[PDB]
Structure formats: structure tokens, C-alpha cells
């Protein structure tokens, strides 16, 4: 049989797909996640804050 990729296929998005949220997903916290401090963030982190005494 043909072992190569098929170039004659639909290259566009499928509108006939389920548009709703999936109830069959893992509802639990992920234990396999980066536990470290992520040395990539805005180090000048004064971007925008309330300048008044109260929120």
C-alpha cells in the first residue's frame, strides 16, 4: 500500500466538530508540572496598580 503522506486531503478546519466543553477530562491537579521558579518573567514588575489607598 502507499506508505507516504496523502497530499490530497482537506487542508481546512472542520466546522463539524463538537463545540462544547469536554466533561471527560482529568479534574485533578497535575503532579507532573514544573516545580521551579521560572527564570523568565517581567523583572521590572511594576506594570499597573491602584494608586489609591483602597481598592
Amino acid at each position: 500500500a502507499n506508505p507516504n503522506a496523502n497530499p490530497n486531503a482537506n487542508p481546512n478546519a472542520n466546522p463539524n466538530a463538537n463545540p462544547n466543553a469536554n466533561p471527560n477530562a482529568n479534574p485533578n491537579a497535575n503532579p507532573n508540572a514544573n516545580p521551579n521558579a521560572n527564570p523568565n518573567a517581567n523583572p521590572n514588575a511594576n506594570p499597573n496598580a491602584n494608586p489609591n489607598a483602597n481598592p
Binding site: 481546512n12 466546522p15 463539524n16 463545540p19
Partner: protein, 112 residues
């Protein structure tokens, strides 16, 4: 309207009538589901049949549907006075970029 429906179908009260919906090889003959809607003259459409055999809670047992090959049919048994409404068949057409494709719309009049 890629789905073809008869413009009108009539029958006497108490008898059985059938509304057909004929498609092609891209929408119905490709294996996609056919759903039916009912619109009274002055209100929005209401879902009637989904999955080609199933019905919601409010819909009575009188309405039934089926599909086979390239065509699908909606069968109504025991016509009543309130069944005067427009019936639409909806499916998905492989050849377009839209979620739904509707039929022409069949107006049912019971000879009361």
C-alpha cells in the same frame, strides 16, 4: 438549500402523513445525522427529532423519524389540529464551510 423537501403536505385528521428529506452523497449519504425542527406560525423553532430516531421530553410519541440511503423521512401518525407547522430537516454538508445546512421547509396542513 442542499436538502430537498416537498413545499407542502396535507392529510385528514387521524391519518398518517410523511415528510421526506432527500440529500446527496455529501450530507446524508456520507453518514451524517439528520435532525428535525418544528416552527409554529408565530414562534421560534423547537427541536423535534435528533439522531434520526430520538425525541425530546416535550415531544409526544406521535412524531417519529428514520433515515436510509440518501433520503430521510419524518412520519406523523394521528394528525391533530395543532400540528399545522413548518418542518425543517437539518444535516451537515461536507462541501461547505458551515456547521448546519437546512432544507427548504414543508408546511403541513390538516384538513380540519
Amino acid at each position: 438549500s442542499v436538502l430537498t423537501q416537498p413545499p407542502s403536505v396535507s392529510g385528514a385528521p387521524g391519518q398518517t402523513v410523511t415528510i421526506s428529506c432527500t440529500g446527496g452523497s455529501s450530507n446524508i449519504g456520507a453518514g451524517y445525522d439528520v435532525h428535525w425542527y418544528q416552527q409554529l406560525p408565530g414562534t421560534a423553532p423547537k427541536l423535534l427529532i435528533y439522531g434520526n430516531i430520538n425525541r425530546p421530553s416535550g415531544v409526544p410519541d406521535r412524531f417519529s423519524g428514520s433515515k436510509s440511503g440518501t433520503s430521510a423521512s419524518l412520519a406523523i401518525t394521528g394528525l391533530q389540529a395543532e400540528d399545522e407547522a413548518d418542518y425543517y430537516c437539518q444535516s451537515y454538508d461536507r462541501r461547505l464551510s458551515g456547521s448546519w445546512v437546512f432544507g427548504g421547509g414543508t408546511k403541513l396542513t390538516v384538513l380540519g
